[PDB]
From a paper:
To understand the structural basis and how DNA is stabilized in these complexes, we determined the structures of PspF1-275-RNAP-σ54-DNA containing mismatches between −11 and −8 [RPi(−11/−8)] and between −10 and −1 [RPi(−10/−1)]. In the RPi(−10/−1) complex, we also observe a range of PspF1-275 hexamer ring conformations with one resolved to higher resolution. Interestingly, in this conformation, the hexamer ring has similar tilt as that of RPi (−11/−8) at ~50° while the DNA is bent even further (>70°) compared to that RPi(−11/−8). Despite the conformational differences, similarly to RPi(−12/−11) structure, the protomer that engages with DNA is also at the highest position within the hexamer ring. In these complexes, we observe a previously unreported interaction between PspF and σ54 RpoN domain. This interaction is only possible with the tilted ring conformation, suggesting this interaction contributes to the stabilization of this ring conformation in both RPi(−11/−8) and RPi(−10/−1), giving rise to the higher-resolution reconstruction of these conformations. Given the PspF1-275 rings are in similar positions between RPi(−11/−8) and RPi(−10/−1) complexes, we could compare the relative positions of each protomer between RPi(−11/−8) and RPi(−10/−1). Compared to RPi(−11/−8), the position of the power stroke protomer (protomer 1) has shifted within the ring, with the protomer in position 2 now becoming the power stroke protomer (protomer 1 position) in, suggesting that these two complexes could represent two states as described in Fig. 3 after the hydrolysis of protomer 1. Interestingly, protomer 1 in RPi(−10/−1) is shifted significantly toward protomer 6 compared to that of RPi(−11/−8), with the distance between L1 of these two protomers reduced from 27 Å to 4 Å, consistent with our proposed mechanistic model that hydrolysis of protomer 1 at the top of the spiral causes it to relocate downward in the hexamer spiral. Significantly, we observe the σ54 N terminus is further shifted along the PspF hexamer in RPi(−11/−8) and RPi(−10/−1) compared to that of RPi(−12/−11).
Bacteria use sigma (σ) factors to recruit RNA polymerase (RNAP) to promoter regions of genes that need to be transcribed, with 60% bacteria containing at least one specialized σ factor, σ54, responsible for transcribing many stress response genes. The σ54-mediated transcription initiation requires specific AAA+ proteins (ATPases Associated with diverse cellular Activities) known as bacterial enhancer-binding proteins (bEBPs). DNA looping enables bEBP hexamers to engage and actively remodel the RNAP-σ54-DNA closed complex to convert it into an open complex. In this work we capture intermediate states of bEBPs in facilitating DNA opening and partial unfolding of σ54, and therefore link the ATPase activity to DNA opening and σ54 remodeling, which eventually lead to transcription activation.
Residue numbers in the entry:
A (entry chain 1), D (entry chain 6): 3 to 258
B (entry chain M): 1 to 48
C (entry chain M): 288 to 382
E (entry chain 5), G (entry chain 3): 1 to 259
F (entry chain 2): 1 to 258
């Protein structure tokens, strides 16, 4: 299940995990909310780990990253569409994800036409394919993920309010890890052990009171990886298992 | 949109192929076309 | 003006046309329908060819009017692409 | 009668319905100004049903989302070589608009040139061509829907004054969401029943005094969407007919 | 060369004399400019002028300076040849090329870009131009029609308009009579609007307008001269409801609440 | 494990420390960042790092993070399968796919566009990707590294730089010691430049450097000198053009008419 | 690698030193920058360097900066493979690729785009093929030449150009002598222009210039330098007409409202 890797921020994070697990048997579309650079993929990990999803193939797409003028047509079915003769071409991930999990990542930065097409696909069921003249709704688990406040975008008109409200029935948020400092020491120890294993170090030398105080003082806007990234960088820089670490540098730009 | 001449995008195929009937029509055969029409009318009983 | 006497003309068998629906045999009806479809396609192709030839002739006469006025000695040069431009079909059709 | 969904029990709602029924036979332009949601599109659809040409389709679907060029292109469709070279010829919103009535949602956001073109189409009765090398004539009714003060823009001169005058053959003001007082409970009961039908719950567990007090204190800025969305969210949260409804879910974006 | 009276009304005012003068200009094919505020039947006047000539058999078209896409407007004026821009499926004929030998109406001349002004002045009745991606120039014939609600001499003094364009245009100026000052024709126009509404409303009969409505209309400044008049007539007819007795109320401001 | 060493010419007691840190970092395959200015230069530092890793056997392709075709950027990164698009009949391997098991140096990431930033986004963490022709995505291990000359923290503060991408990348940052900060091996670098240039000019021999020229160089601010110092050396040598007389005067800036 | 004497010779000791430095740099392969006014013969200097270069057979690329279409300008710079983009069928040879192993003298280098600046910097930085659709880079042994009529340090101070690019641009600066710096060579250039004009116009012979003409030349400052001299001499010759008497006055301003 690989859930123990995430290890949760706290029992409150474990409570959200329990709620998500209760929701896992449901294959209805879902909305994922979480801070940028905060383990949002691991949220999709449990949804994929759902037993119904465990049977099918999980497909997750970065909506912001996925962008091309032809790709606008490529996302469309065309499973029989042959304008250049390539009928066998499929909707892509849209066709591939059939029978398994589907996930839209960074959906905020997407063309509005693509959003409407997905919203149209979401509304009712697939029919009247572009080439096949008969699209078919596939019982494939799907969910959406975003970071910013799309409500502000819709207020500015950037967010499709129809899809947003439509997806506003299965929204789950990820609280900032900066709030949960308890698991911070645990995750830091896990990262230290993993680095010691990777760099063939004798063991993790551990932290210090100065190091713990600095970790507390750090704002840590990125926590899932950026905190771990700083941990790994400090482990590499230290190169000394003689003593536990007491000086951790976060801002690489900070000379000396 | 905008006016431009960028040279990289998707497209479709050219004019659809295998228009044999149109190809024969485009060529002019004069009396030979008349002879072919006579042969076809012999083949087609619903033509006069 | 094209030679009307030389212009081919085909007629549809009205008696055969009035015997398709009344047929009680599936094979005979299917054969009649196929023959009618083939005849319609052939007639459409012939009419399209005649219309294209007439349009090409009109375009050439528009070009040839300058040539005819200029005379044989002062005939203007002409290109296949130049004539194909005067029409809407591909230059292959013109050739 | 299409079940009279979202019936306005208010006396002003009944008066507006009577005026619309009087106006529905009239085949003249109509403009609507009101609050967010409020089923204004639903009112337009009911009037279209109230119209004699019940058979005729009413595409409507003119929310202000596309860019200035994009919105006009949607209005003007696409053609061969359009937009300085277009691959596909799109019939566009205008083509679907011909015949039956159409609704213009948030019509104020459009450029004044588009407004002039639309008014000329209304004035002339001949459709405007994206290519422009071919004439076009269309006969259909139209419905206008904005939210701000058209006279304010006219004083500002933003909108075409003649277009505003011609369009406002009959303005349609709307009462506020705060204007309605007693219909809140009726709409809540209707939503609970429709959800129990949809969510297959045995019955609506009923509300409590805390729920009624929160609803009374609720701003409910969304006249239509906010109430329905909040009801759906609360129903999804509860999912049981055993306990009458007492907990209130206010902010979909709420955290912790 | 037919009568085609169509929408001919308001002859009590000097608009009749204006039409009489324009009748002489109708055979003319020189530059034409019309002066008048919005809602003054200016399009109707232009249509009457274009229909007046038997050259109405020729292609009579209208155009207003609505920018839309500036590049698109430039192409429409110029005419996109096939393949001129990326993806151009075929040659797009120019807006000017669409109507040769027939009248052309130019509107919103005040609301015309200075670059657009220069583009238009390029063929300032020059009669010949080149298409977008056109190999050789082409010369056509058309009588342009101009109209605006703004003081072109002022904008020229302001420099907003193109003085060369102003000179190239406006061989004749048609000043619209003030319908706000055309009180005598107002009653006849009201009668015509009532007749049209009775044709449209399909009620039993027109009850009438009494005199309070007429007095209110006299009090009304009628900023919309010919357009708002008919619209207010229709609105008042609708609000009156029953046609038992002549209506005396006036539907002045629909933006204002009915009560 | 072998080292060609290229051309170091660095003994500033801090360039050596930076090189040692890189050597410690050389085994690491995580994404790296370089604070390399023009006057800092040192694009070859990335090449030295690439040679240092065992991926020296692998492809050492460096990505020019600018001058990218806007129309075909997606295919540029990814490439196309045999079907490809309407324009293409064959299979476009793709630049990112062309790199595998080796170092990928993003050169001047600052010049990249926001759309380019989005394209690069999720191309790092995910790794798996499909060709333009479309296929099952595949992730290929390859060393990651990038460089720029400005303060990307400001760009993030400016918002121009995609902060998520920068934060995700750059497991470590390389800071180039300033030429003003170096201030030690000036004479040695000048001698090396003269030795290299003499063969190019087929010059007789090095006339040597006078004390006045050395004092001028010391007083010279020389804010940018990574290649500017060598270029000034070449210009001064061309101006002197006399192997008989030792060098004493150098054109400080090719701007004053003098 | 040839003599190829050029009659356009600067008769100045400063010009002599400039020619000496140019000859010294002619064997050099490092790119250099030419500084000078517009119409200051910089193109002639570039041609002289190209001829005097060791690569006599080496190509001489015009390298106009502002000529870029900017729609696909890099593609022209970078070339392409056969089919690199939509509708492509032949391997496009890049401008540098076309001029590979030759010489490119960046023309209008002052006027260029920032994206153009970045592309040029990338090209300069140990240039490789990296063609559009290219699967493998290459190298080119083509020298580079730079020239502009603007204060590049000032432009950089304005941020108009990339500081690295300018640093990557020149190994030395070729400052053209000012026309005011030039002196007394005006007589020789005037004589050459007179001979050329007499030959072209089929005139009998050169009438010559009088003392008033010499004094005016002394007073006159030619901002365009040779081009200014060429135009003034051309105007004076055209107005001269008959060659019966030597010239005494020349049209100072080709655009003067006087008379
Ligand atoms: N506790 C953990 N165990 C394993 N992997 C983790 C843990 N926390 C973070 N990660 C990894 O760090 C990466 C950071 O991803 P992130 O940037 O948070 O995703 P997103 O941008 O969607 O929020 C994730 O891909 C995840 O695999
Ligand atoms: N003399 C007339 N008789 C009948 N109708 C008229 C007369 N003059 C103007 N009209 C009508 O008044 C309407 C409003 O005119 P106006 O808004 O000025 O048109 P435009 O603004 O397009 O010139 C016109 O549609 C025209 O048909
Ligand atoms: N140890 C060294 N030996 C020789 N040359 C060096 C050494 N270190 C730096 N350089 C020179 O410094 C210059 C910096 O150029 P480059 O790194 O391309 O600039 P940037 O990285 O700012 O684009 C290089 O041309 C290189 O020749
Ligand atoms: N030394 C010279 N003697 C005579 N004529 C010259 C000389 N140098 C330049 N010219 C003329 O002056 C003109 C200057 O043009 P150009 O070379 O473009 O100057 P720039 O490149 O500085 O604009 C040339 O066309 C050339 O004919
Ligand atoms: Mg993420
Ligand atoms: Mg008008
Ligand atoms: Mg470099
Ligand atoms: Mg020049």
């Amino acid at each position: 299940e690989y859930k123990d890797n995430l290890l949760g921020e706290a029992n409150s994070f474990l409570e959200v995990l329990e709620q998500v697990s209760h929701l896992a048997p449901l294959d209805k579309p879902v909305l994922i909310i979480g801070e940028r650079g905060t383990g949002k993929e691991l949220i999709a990990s449990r949804l994929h780990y759902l037993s119904s999803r465990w049977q099918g193939p999980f497909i997750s797409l970065n909506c912001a990253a996925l962008n091309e003028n032809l790709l606008d047509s490529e996302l469309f079915g065309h499973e029989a569409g042959a304008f250049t003769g390539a009928q066998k071409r499929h909707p892509g991930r849209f066709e591939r994800a059939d029978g398994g999990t589907l996930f839209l990542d960074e959906l905020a930065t997407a063309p509005m036409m693509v959003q409407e097409k997905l919203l149209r696909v979401i509304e009712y069921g697939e029919l009247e394919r572009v080439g096949g003249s008969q699209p078919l709704q596939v019982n494939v688990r799907l969910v959406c993920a975003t970071n910013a406040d799309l409500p502000a975008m819709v207020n500015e008109g950037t967010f499709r309010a129809d899809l947003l409200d439509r997806l506003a029935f299965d929204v789950v948020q990820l609280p900032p890890l900066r709030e949960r400092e308890s698991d911070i020491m645990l995750m830091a120890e896990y990262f230290a052990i993993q680095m010691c294993r990777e760099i063939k170090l004798p063991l993790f030398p551990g932290f210090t009171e100065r190091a713990r105080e600095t970790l507390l003082n750090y704002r840590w806007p990125g926590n899932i990886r950026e905190l771990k990234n700083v941990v790994e960088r400090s482990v590499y820089r230290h190169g000394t298992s003689d003593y536990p670490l007491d000086d951790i540098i976060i801002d690489p730009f900070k000379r000396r | 949109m905008k006016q431009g001449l960028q040279l990289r995008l998707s497209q479709q195929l050219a004019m659809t192929p295998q228009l044999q009937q149109a190809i024969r029509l485009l060529q002019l055969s004069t009396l030979e076309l008349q002879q072919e029409l006579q042969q076809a009318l012999e083949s087609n009983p619903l033509l006069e | 003006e094209l030679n009307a006497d030389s212009i081919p003309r085909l007629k549809i068998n009205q008696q055969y046309a009035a015997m398709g629906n009344s047929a009680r045999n599936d094979a005979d009806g299917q054969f009649i329908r196929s023959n009618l479809q083939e005849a319609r396609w052939l007639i459409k192709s012939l009419e399209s060819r005649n219309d294209t030839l007439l349009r090409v002739s009109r375009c050439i006469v528009e070009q040839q009017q300058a040539f005819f006025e200029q005379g044989e000695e002062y005939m203007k040069p002409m290109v296949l692409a130049d004539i194909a431009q005067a029409v809407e079909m591909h230059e292959s059709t013109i050739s």
